[PDB]
Amino acid sequence: KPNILFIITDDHAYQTLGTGNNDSPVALPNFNKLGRQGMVFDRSYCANSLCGPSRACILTGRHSHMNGFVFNGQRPLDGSQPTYPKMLQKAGYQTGLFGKWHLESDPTGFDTWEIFPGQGSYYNPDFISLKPDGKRQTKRFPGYATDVVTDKSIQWLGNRDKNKPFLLVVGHKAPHRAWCPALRHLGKVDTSSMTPPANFHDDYANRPEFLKKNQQTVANHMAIYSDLKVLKDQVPEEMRKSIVSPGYGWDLGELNRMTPEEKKTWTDYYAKRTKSLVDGMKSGKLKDPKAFAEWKWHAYMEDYLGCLLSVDDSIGRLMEYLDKEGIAKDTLVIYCGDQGFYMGEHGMYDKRWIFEESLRMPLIMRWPGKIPAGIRNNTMVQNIDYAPTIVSAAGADTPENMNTFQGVSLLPTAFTGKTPDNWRDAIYYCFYENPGEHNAPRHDGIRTDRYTLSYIWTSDEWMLFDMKKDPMQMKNVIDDPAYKTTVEQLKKRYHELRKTYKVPENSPGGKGTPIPKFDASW
Ligand SMILES: CC(=O)N[C@@H]1[C@@H](O)[C@H](O)[C@@H](CO)O[C@H]1O
Numbered sequence: 001k002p003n004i005l006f007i008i009t010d011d012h013a014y015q016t017l018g019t020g021n022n023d024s025p026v027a028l029p030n031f032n033k034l035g036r037q038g039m040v041f042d043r044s045y046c047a048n049s050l051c052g053p054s055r056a057c058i059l060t061g062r063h064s065h066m067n068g069f070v071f072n073g074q075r076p077l078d079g080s081q082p083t084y085p086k087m088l089q090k091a092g093y094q095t096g097l098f099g100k101w102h103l104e105s106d107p108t109g110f111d112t113w114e115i116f117p118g119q120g121s122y123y124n125p126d127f128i129s130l131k132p133d134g135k136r137q138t139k140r141f142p143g144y145a146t147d148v149v150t151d152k153s154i155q156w157l158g159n160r161d162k163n164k165p166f167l168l169v170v171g172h173k174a175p176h177r178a179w180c181p182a183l184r185h186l187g188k189v190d191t192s193s194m195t196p197p198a199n200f201h202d203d204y205a206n207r208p209e210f211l212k213k214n215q216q217t218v219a220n221h222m223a224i225y226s227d228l229k230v231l232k233d234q235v236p237e238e239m240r241k242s243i244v245s246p247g248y249g250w251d252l253g254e255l256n257r258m259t260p261e262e263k264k265t266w267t268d269y270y271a272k273r274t275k276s277l278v279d280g281m282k283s284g285k286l287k288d289p290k291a292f293a294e295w296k297w298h299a300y301m302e303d304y305l306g307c308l309l310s311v312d313d314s315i316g317r318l319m320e321y322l323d324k325e326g327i328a329k330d331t332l333v334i335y336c337g338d339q340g341f342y343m344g345e346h347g348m349y350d351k352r353w354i355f356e357e358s359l360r361m362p363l364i365m366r367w368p369g370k371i372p373a374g375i376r377n378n379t380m381v382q383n384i385d386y387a388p389t390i391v392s393a394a395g396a397d398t399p400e401n402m403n404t405f406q407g408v409s410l411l412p413t414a415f416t417g418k419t420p421d422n423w424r425d426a427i428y429y430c431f432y433e434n435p436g437e438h439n440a441p442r443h444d445g446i447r448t449d450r451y452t453l454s455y456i457w458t459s460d461e462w463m464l465f466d467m468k469k470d471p472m473q474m475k476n477v478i479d480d481p482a483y484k485t486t487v488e489q490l491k492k493r494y495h496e497l498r499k500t501y502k503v504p505e506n507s508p509g510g511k512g513t514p515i516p517k518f519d520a521s522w
């Protein structure tokens with residue numbers, strides 16, 4: 001019975017996973033090692049690109065409509081339903097959880113837990129925990145969230161009953177907005193040699209009309225002072241009106257959480273960027289909106305990647321303990337980001353879309369002896385598969401537990417690095433957060449090996465992208481006659497998957513419908 005160390009970041013883009021020569025914009029040595037000692041799944045996707053929905057999928061091995069948590073709303077997750085933590089706890093595991101939970105309800109199946117209230121805070125984080133009395137308390141811990149989460153995790157591991165296999169879930173806030181790096185990492189990231197993606201200035205042509213209404217563009221939807229860290233006090237009052245997108249001028253909340261010592265180190269560094277902005281404005285260069293948008297991009301890249309430096313550190317402190325305790329051969333290590341992120345592709349940030357960047361989520365596994373070390377796996381895997389995989393690896397895959405899952409165990413492919421003969425030809429995706437922050441439409445679809453077919457419910461628009469001929473998904477080929485029969489093929493496959501996954505009709509629902517509520521079912 002192996003231990004299970006499960007590390008889950010918030011908004012980690014696979015473009016920056018750090019496993020190889022093509023996903024390392026910043027060098028992440030410990031990310032690369034875990035790659036070298038294990039398996040990366042380059043074809044790893046989620047079922048709903050949002051933090052709360054994806055966490056519920058991982059937990060239940062079931063799609064959003066089946067597990068009930070379909071968006072980041074104030075409706076708590078049904079913690080009474082079957083979850084792999086509770087399954088493992090029933091198979092003798094000791095269970096622990098530290099950091100981002102974000103499912104509202106008290107975590108079930110976990111002997112220990114201390115989670116952030118909501119998104120959490122990078123600097124001087126608050127934690128919530130039941131007392132031995134079991135009444136929720138809230139305590140603040142000094143330090144940087146990525147460090148403190150690792151601190152608590154490792155401590156919990158050494159205080160563990162070493163005769164029971166453990167489940168430890170390590171949920172980081174990084175790399176999540178507003179992308180505040182640790183003080184020791186300020187300046188360590190140099191983007192001035194980086195070039196925005198080919199479609200940074202995307203005009204949205206040959207894509208559904210609704211995409212022009214998205215509010216997750218680097219150029220028009222970033223808080224200049226909060227996201228991009230600019231200092232208002234050092235910007236001429238005359239200039240503030242020309243640097244702030246309308247409604248996007250709010251302050252950086254983390255500053256209120258820093259101590260004076262901390263607060264100064266931060267402003268001391270970020271006066272450079274603030275000056276760099278003022279220089280590009282008075283010189284006129286930053287007044288061309290396309291230039292301003294690229295400048296925005298570079299700051300965004302600096303701070304996002306900067307955050308990954310302490311994640312990388314976290315990965316190192318956790319992997320070191322495993323080795324010094326001599327249990328790496330008896331520990332399944334799963335790393336993932338709850339879903340992916342736009343690193344400027346289509347001039348966008350965040351997730352929520354069926355487009356490849358946010359439909360993917362980075363997946364890495366290390367099980368020495370069991371999982372071929374150094375393999376990149378191209379099998380199509382989804383976040384609804386994790387729970388059946390954790391349970392199998394735990395010998396708790398009774399027919400009872402396994403039946404509650406819609407995902408497929410990944411051990412066969414994890415053990416060989418290749419696609420088994422009978423593998424799914426397509427996954428199903430569905431996003432429900434409209435109306436919602438960032439104005440993503442309610443939409444769903446399937447992802448096949450070659451294609452992406454999505455129906456946008458909010459705007460009543462279909463879209464097909466041919467990945468073999470268009471991996472940047474810039475030309476909607478639905479309504480191209482060459483793909484006529486393909487659309488027919490796919491549309492049937494689409495409706496078949498909806499029927500197999502027991503998707504309700506009129507879900508996720510178009511503009512005339514409320515965001516659906518579901519009771520958990522299995
Ligand atoms: C201002 C801000 O932080 N906005 C973020 C948003 O971008 C993100 O999508 C959401 C949860 O993912 O949390 C919001 O708070």
Ligand SMILES: [Ca+2]
Binds near residue numbers: 050
């Ligand atoms: Ca997330």
